[PDB]
From a paper:
In an effort to address this limitation, we undertook a systematic effort to produce bright and stable circularly permutated variants of two naturally occurring proteins, mCherry, a monomeric variant of the Discosoma sp. coral protein DsRed, and mKate, a monomeric variant of the anemone [name] protein eqFP578. Here we report the systematic evaluation of circular permutation sites in mCherry and mKate, and the development of highly efficient circularly permutated red fluorescent proteins (cp-RFPs). We performed a similar circular permutation analysis of the monomeric far-red protein mKate, which derives from the sea anemone [name] and shares structural similarities with mCherry. Structural analysis revealed three highly homologous loop regions in mCherry and mKate, and these areas along with flanking sites were systematically explored.
Finally, crystallization and structural analysis of cp-mKate154-153 and cp-mKate168-167 revealed the expected tertiary structure previously reported for mKate, with only slight variations around the permutation point. A. Cartoon presentation of mKate (pH 7.0), cp-mKate154-153 and cp-mKate168-167. In this regard an individual construct could be regarded as either an amino or carboxy deletion; thus cp-mKate154-150, for example, is an amino truncation of cp-mKate151-150, or a carboxy truncation of cp-mKate154-153. Future studies will be directed at determining the structural basis for fluorescence variation in circular permutants of mKate.
Numbering used by the authors:
A (entry chain A), B (entry chain G), C (entry chain B), D (entry chain F): 0 to 147, 151 to 236
Write the structure that this text describes.
């Protein structure tokens, strides 16, 4: 039993306009099935923003605000669900995170580290990111943004927090992002808890980004906000 | 200058679980560009529900609640939104609609008519739908649900209503719904205003739906709510 | 029981280079299952060439050579298939065709008629095509090329000709062509035999072709040759 | 300047039938552009067959025969490649190969080694493959078949051999395979020549393969033969 997510995000392009991409994510728990209180269908509203940038994109500081909900709207049918209610004690309201990243984008190899802090229950976080190997990146940094934190989703409407419940075992995610110009970037990730710090271990592998298109030429200017739909399966 | 939308909807399956599909929509105005007050990026939360169904799905009555917004969430940067403010006079707060649909799904041809009423500014509406030809359909009616009214979106927060402003000329849409099991359903549509009634004319052409998959075997059970991301281009 | 095909075609672009698209076709028979001699997996090599063009693309003349085969190459295992042998009699070795087409591409409506002749068993044909409505098209004619004749495939090596067997009842196809820049074009089609003439009925519904991309700007120069992979299911 | 490829392969299923997937590959040379003799558009017919299998798939011995061509078919126009002609001294007619592979498929990690030999100019090769970590795999070995050899393509008809020309520098490839049931498997690979042996280094990352589908349940039975379409870009 896991959660699958789906999003369509929009990339802002130099000169106006946008490039769309599609996110198919599968969220897997390391905690055993019997001990989880599974949600029903729900949505997470994010806004992901580039705060600071230095050195041809080899240093980037990212902020994110994530908030989960159920459909607020009244329903002529009986899907109040609703339901809800989850509590997660290992996660304090002030948490620190450390991350390591490694992968390839169009045959170009690179490594990244980051450290950050945020407020899980409030739905906010920040990430200070270093490109350590294979900088300057020849591709728009934006495409890695979604790969740097499911724990910091503010589940307010009682909705069961599938990510915060998982600890200490942890959770993984694995995602395939599909740009409409042809590019494809898959990423696998491990979230674990050691001494009260959240440890992220990612692996990027992207291919087929058009060479004379916005991603490789770096004509991008951050993302718009987005809605992820999340739903349980098998 | 027009609006493109992107949504991912979830289809409910007999036995739990879901089949996801992707909606790429282009909304075009018949009113001239200069006379339109274009919105910025925004989102529409819908909930579409089958009220009544009779005769192996040859009569179906649908209700929808659509509410548009901007990102409520605070932004570290200065994308205040909120701009806004649009007024559209031809659309009263009680509207009636009449519809004709014709198209093919996996070589099987069919025709539909419908009539309904709803409250545009409140975001609510109802549709009473008849299969007048080629019923009973060998496919789940659900896949047509999204093809029957952009005017009944409650634009509050002072978001410019691209759909209402358009009147009297009217507007069209054209969409490609892409199921993850392989099916593909495109639709072209014309909206227009004649004697204070909203007139819909649709055309469907769906192909490649697996014969032994949920859609053809009719093992589906309505949609979950969804979020559409609407954005201006060219 | 029917045949599915898959092709990837390449579009020649003004200035060198190519735009790839994907063809998913389902070919369905009108003749009863028991009286057909089903093929195995096999391949069709085509080369489609614009012989003539006049009037801003409102007259186009097409030649096609199609030849189906099985893998000639030796197999370490014993896949023979192999098999083969079909004869089809309603189809003479000189056939004439008449075709009608109607559909939409990015909200622009149009109709086409054509007449042509070829040698089915030899795998050749020509088509003389008139745009009778909604010319001049604001889009590259190329994208319609693949919608104007399955009967004229030279099945050598003894492969059972699934298309020639169908007569007199006839057969349909229905296809989704998916460009990598985003455009999508589906087409459903009906074949039949009336008075020794082959009668084609096509319908087009294409959407989402980027306005500032090759297809809408007409910066194309025909297709490259292609291989279609044909295989039976249900 | 490099080569892109496109294929559609068919996977054989327990109980008959097939699951199709799409291959987008980009082939990059490590040898400098001025010294390469680029091909034109062309095709490769392969047949990949599992010879032996032992220990729940932890040992697989693979055979491949690859033969490249242009379009044998006559053209009503001036397009005859034909050109062709390439010579590659460093590659003998009996070559040896050693490979290391590492990656993840649906959150499951694994490593593979293989060694093999074949006749590059004749277009044949064999691979003896050992699963060295994380066996037995919970997924159909098939989805890995295409990741173990571009040097052993028999370029007849005189097509300039882009893979053999690269030596000694070597070449990389990177590919995205997209199943129609939802799975996605990208792979990056490094080829090189050291002491007269071909050295392969692969990395796999497959995701979003359906849990209740053929690949994960191991209901597969090898590939059908296939055609890849190769074309130059940049
Ligand atoms: Mg969405």
């Amino acid at each position: 039993e896991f959660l699958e997510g789906r999003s369509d995000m929009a990339l802002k392009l130099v000169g106006g306009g946008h490039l769309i991409c599609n996110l198919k994510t599968t969220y897997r728990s390391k905690k055993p099935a019997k001990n989880l209180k599974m949600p029903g269908v729900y949505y997470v509203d994010r806004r992901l923003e580039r705060i600071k940038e230095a050195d041809k994109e080899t240093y980037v500081e990212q902020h994110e605000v994530a908030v989960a909900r159920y459909c607020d709207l009244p329903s002529k049918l009986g899907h109040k669900g609703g339901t809800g209610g989850s509590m997660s004690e290992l996660i304090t309201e002030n948490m620190h995170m450390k991350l390591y990243m490694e992968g390839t984008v169009n045959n170009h190899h690179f490594k990244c580290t980051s450290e950050g802090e945020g407020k899980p229950y409030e739905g906010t976080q920040t990430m200070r990111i270093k490109v350590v190997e294979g900088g300057p990146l020849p591709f728009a940094f934006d495409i890695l943004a979604t790969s740097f934190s499911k724990t910091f989703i503010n589940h307010t409407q009682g909705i069961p927090d599938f990510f915060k419940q998982s600890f200490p075992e942890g959770f993984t995610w694995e995602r395939v992002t599909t740009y409409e110009d042809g590019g494809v970037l898959t990423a696998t990730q491990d979230t674990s808890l050691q001494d009260g710090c959240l440890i992220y271990n990612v692996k990027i592998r992207g291919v087929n980004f058009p060479s004379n298109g916005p991603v490789m030429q770096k004509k991008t200017l951050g993302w718009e906000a987005s809605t992820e739909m999340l739903y349980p399966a098998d």
